[PDB]
Write a protein that binds this DNA or RNA. Structure first.
Ligand SMILES: [Mg+2]
Ligand SMILES: [Mg+2]
Ligand SMILES: [Mg+2]
Ligand SMILES: [Mg+2]
Ligand SMILES: [Mg+2]
Ligand SMILES: [Mg+2]
Ligand SMILES: [Mg+2]
Ligand SMILES: [Mg+2]
Ligand SMILES: [Mg+2]
Ligand SMILES: [Mg+2]
Ligand SMILES: [Mg+2]
Ligand SMILES: [Mg+2]
Ligand SMILES: [Mg+2]
Ligand SMILES: [Mg+2]
Ligand SMILES: [Mg+2]
Ligand SMILES: [Mg+2]
Ligand SMILES: [Mg+2]
Ligand SMILES: [Mg+2]
Ligand SMILES: [Mg+2]
Ligand SMILES: [Mg+2]
Ligand SMILES: [Mg+2]
Ligand SMILES: [Mg+2]
Ligand SMILES: [Mg+2]
Lengths: 117, 65, 88, 99, 106
RNA sequence: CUUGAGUCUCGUAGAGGGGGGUAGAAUUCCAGGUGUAGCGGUGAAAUGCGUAGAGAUCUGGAGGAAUACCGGUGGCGAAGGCGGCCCCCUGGACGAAGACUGACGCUCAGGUGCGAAAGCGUGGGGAGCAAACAGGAUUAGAUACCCUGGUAGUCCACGCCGUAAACGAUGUCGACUUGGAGGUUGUGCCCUUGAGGCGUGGCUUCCGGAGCUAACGCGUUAAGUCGACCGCCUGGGGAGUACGGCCGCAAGGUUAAAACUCAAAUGAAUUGACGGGGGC
């Protein structure tokens, strides 16, 4: 409801979903839409088209906060980073920088065993 | 290439931040000798000096802070 | 290992002259000095097996040096093994 | 196993080893992978890479060229990573998402 | 009787407390028959990452030639003092009496 | 006697070993700020999670385990193995120039020690991971593969176990025999000196000559030419099994047969066939 006019969009790009959330520069969130919550499931739940649909649905819920300046931070090399980026770029937003911030450990924990498929 | 051999330095100071910044990326991770052309001995010295400088907070570990 | 001062003193003591570092006597003396010193190390680092491999090697070579000395001239052999308190 | 399950898994693994374990400055652009399709036999696989830089062929050409030249390296990484039988031969293709 | 490079940082809120600690440590290491070959007070500097939600720490360097005992109780004092946030003790085969790059800029 | 083997002196490189500290990412959890209906998962799904407010996001804290980048067709170690940084204790290797000892050497049945992982005993710890197990699916069937959970275990201390495709499937030591291209680590001398040139050692990777080999291949780090000692083999199966001994808390290890059965079993290379392949 207020005016910040300079926010940041976290894009959790999972291999099964894509979570876009715009937040105040100090981590306080404003709104969010998901590729799942945009009426998609199964395969389509993780397709770039559904990713851009979710990006636009989330943009349509923060426009009343009055922002068109964004930095975006992407996490997870899932399909649906390119899509949401170009979507929120085609939503009248000005993106100053895009940043890969996926959490990479320095050999922290043992990962789950590989799937035998 | 092999700049340290031209310098002739016995050891690379971890206090020489100006020099060390030329061997880390913006991410803050060490650059392999494969592209800087550094001799293996001096690349090991660089790795040790950079890790020491990171400990003393003279260089960042990552770019996320 | 041994410090330079310790080795220099042991050479001067058991050797013929200052630069008699090769005699069997000074070799046995250096070996037993290092062994006695390493006893304290292995009293607490009892699962340091690599250093213990090195120690066992030096014990073995002291043994064969002593055997060569006993076979060369038993008088000096006995005098040495009594000056160091060995072979008992 | 079924070629499409292996396709999904190999898409995950190629995306992973493509984001992290690359050093070719020719690569970059947050290179994503839209998917990968492979034959009934797991011997061959075609990856559909999607670049971000301007779609001008001067750059996407160089990207696919670098990918095809590093295919051996990516294949070695895949073979040690994803635990299958034959380490398929990889073929990269620009997925023209803009139609 | 080895050579040590001791670099430690001080809480910036105790910046003027620094020379006291400096001269105290030098007195301790010299009264232990241990020389001091260098001592540089780089002063306040901006950290490259937070340390206990903090930046602008007070860096100070020393080069000593001393026995190991005095060095270990010195690092013990470092640990049990709280005005110092982070210390570092390293060895050196020789003696270094020169200018650190953090004073050549000055 | 000094040429083998050692000692001393000065240095060099190293994830060699033991102990103690400490740092920064990440996973999990706990407490808050923001913020709302999904999250998670699959080839599709459900079990699972959330309206007590999850997931996502920022801040703070706890705890355990492992150390991205450097990183290497690298390095160290007898092998197994060893990877942040710092200190302490400590083993070996190598080089330069000398000095010293004077065959002090090599190999080694029995013996002694070390020896991945799993496992065992006692106590502690426990984030992640995960046999067994509990579900959800798939399937003719699933007691598998896939999914959600998840105990032992993985971690530490002290003992035990003593086995691996413990592999270079290549015992140790010494001498000798054409080359070429690298890596790594010393070092000598010379040039206006860094740079560069000419040497000379150690370790190591890859081609290849003679020679060897059934062939594949090996090829100065031999599987070449020789010497010293040790281990071991004698058709396949029975069987590394039985019995006995020794060892072990146990699991079992080690030593190690015969009857009987069959006329082969095997190694390397060759030509094709079979795709529910791939190119042109
Ligand atoms: Mg999927
Ligand atoms: Mg020695
Ligand atoms: Mg070590
Ligand atoms: Mg806990
Ligand atoms: Mg040493
Ligand atoms: Mg003589
Ligand atoms: Mg035996
Ligand atoms: Mg174990
Ligand atoms: Mg059991
Ligand atoms: Mg146990
Ligand atoms: Mg227990
Ligand atoms: Mg699990
Ligand atoms: Mg065996
Ligand atoms: Mg092995
Ligand atoms: Mg064998
Ligand atoms: Mg030989
Ligand atoms: Mg070696
Ligand atoms: Mg060859
Ligand atoms: Mg031979
Ligand atoms: Mg043969
Ligand atoms: Mg038989
Ligand atoms: Mg048996
Ligand atoms: Mg028995």
């Amino acid at each position: 409801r207020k005016q910040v006019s300079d926010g940041v969009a976290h894009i959790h790009a999972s291999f099964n979903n894509t979570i876009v959330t715009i937040t105040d520069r100090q981590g306080n969130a404003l709104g969010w839409a998901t590729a799942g919550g945009s009426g998609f499931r199964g395969s389509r739940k993780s397709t770039p088209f559904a990713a851009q649909v979710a990006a636009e649905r989330c943009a349509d819920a923060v426009k009343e906060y009055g922002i068109k300046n964004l930095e975006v931070m992407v996490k997870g090399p899932g399909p649906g980073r390119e899509s949401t980026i170009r979507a929120l770029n085609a939503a009248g937003f000005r993106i100053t920088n895009i940043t890969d911030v996926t959490p990479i450990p320095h050999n922290g924990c043992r990962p789950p065993k590989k799937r035998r498929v | 290439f092999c700049r340290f051999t031209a310098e002739g330095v016995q050891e690379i100071d971890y206090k020489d931040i100006a020099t060390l910044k030329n061997y880390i990326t913006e991410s803050g991770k060490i650059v392999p000798s494969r592209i800087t052309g550094t001799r293996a001995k001096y690349q090991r010295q660089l790795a040790r000096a950079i890790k020491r400088a990171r400990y003393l907070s003279l260089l960042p570990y990552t770019d996320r802070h | 290992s041994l410090s330079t001062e310790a080795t220099a003193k042991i050479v001067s003591e058991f050797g013929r002259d200052a630069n008699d570092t090769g005699s069997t006597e000074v070799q046995v003396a250096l070996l037993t000095a290092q062994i006695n010193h390493l006893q304290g190390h292995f009293a607490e680092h009892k699962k340091d097996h690599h250093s213990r491999r090195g120690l066992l090697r030096m014990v073995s070579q002291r043994r064969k040096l002593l055997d060569y000395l006993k076979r060369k001239d038993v008088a000096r052999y006995t005098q040495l093994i009594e000056r160091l308190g060995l072979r008992r | 196993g079924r070629p499409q399950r292996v396709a999904q898994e190999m898409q995950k693994e190629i995306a992973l080893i493509l984001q992290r374990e690359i050093k070719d400055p020719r690569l970059g652009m947050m290179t994503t992978v839209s998917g990968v399709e492979m034959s009934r036999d797991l011997a061959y696989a075609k990856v559909y890479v999607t670049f971000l830089n301007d779609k001008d062929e001067d750059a996407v050409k160089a990207g696919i060229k670098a990918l095809q030249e590093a295919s051996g390296f990516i294949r070695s990484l895949l073979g040690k990573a994803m635990r299958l039988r034959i380490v398929p031969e990889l073929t990269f293709f620009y997925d023209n998402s803009l139609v | 009787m080895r050579h040590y490079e001791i670099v430690f940082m001080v809480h910036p809120d105790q910046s003027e407390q620094v020379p006291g600690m400096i001269e105290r440590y030098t007195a301790a290491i010299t009264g232990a028959e241990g020389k001091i070959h260098r001592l540089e007070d780089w002063g306040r500097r901006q950290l490259a990452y937070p340390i206990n939600k903090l930046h602008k720490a007070h860096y100070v360097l020393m080069n000593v030639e001393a026995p190991q005992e005095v060095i270990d109780e010195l690092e013990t004092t470092f640990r049990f003092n709280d005005a110092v946030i982070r210390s570092m003790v390293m060895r050196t085969k020789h003696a270094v009496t020169e200018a650190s790059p953090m004073v050549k800029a000055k």
